[PDB]
Design a protein around this ligand. Sequence first.
Ligand SMILES: CN[C@@H]1CCc2c(ccc(O)c2O)[C@H]1O
Length: 281
Amino acid sequence: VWVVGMGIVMSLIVLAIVFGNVLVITAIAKFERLQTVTNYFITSLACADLVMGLAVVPFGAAHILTKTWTFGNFWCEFWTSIDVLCVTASIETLCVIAVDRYFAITSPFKYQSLLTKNKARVIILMVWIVSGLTSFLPIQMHWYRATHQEAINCYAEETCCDFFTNQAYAIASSIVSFYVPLVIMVFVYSRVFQEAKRQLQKIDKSEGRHKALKTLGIIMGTFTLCWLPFFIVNIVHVIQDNLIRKEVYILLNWIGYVNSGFNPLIYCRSPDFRIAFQELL
Ligand SMILES: CN[C@@H]1CCc2c(ccc(O)c2O)[C@H]1O
């Protein structure tokens, strides 16, 4: 009375993610007026979200609904690697976009000199490579493997897939993937807000006879509310093994997945994108 209908939500999420990401990619690729150095970061972010929505989500949905993993252990390890890869790549691309905006507003004359067409490709490749070294290299060689008896029983059996991780791997991965980008983005947006307030005050002083707050609020709040509650419990549940159950962890992780769907509605609402979308349909 629950399974026969609760798959509708997963189907809707999959459809929304795939449609939004493919529409953004098609709009950027097809029309030449959208070709910009800043738009390449959005292209990489959309590609990461598309891969996530095409691979990670359906298999997880099958895992919860069926409650068994029909496929082998090799596919389980591959799925975990893809999950970690996509998550960290997306979160790092967000910080890259924020730093680009910081450089755009803070230093207006030499914005062009710092970043060109060729440098963006190198930045994106380095971001994806650092993302890859976090997931595939440790998982495939079995560095994260736990040691307690329940983990051994889960790992030996070929029909169960429960994520058991070492303390050191969890801490290092969380620090590399979330907290450093969080700090960088906070500092960047604080400086940007200060500059905007100064300019607004200058204009009001010039023309003798509030708006950036909402713009910063959407971007900060969406990311923080979507990805902060997951990493708190991720860090906590390794130090103490009795506080956090195995269902709240899954619920928070799936809450974090939805953040891929909201990215096109935040970073791709410019008017030129509106003309591009209107022309397509
Ligand atoms: C199966 N879910 C995984 C488990 C742990 C983990 C995730 C995402 C980013 C990380 O850095 C992680 O360590 C989650 O998506």
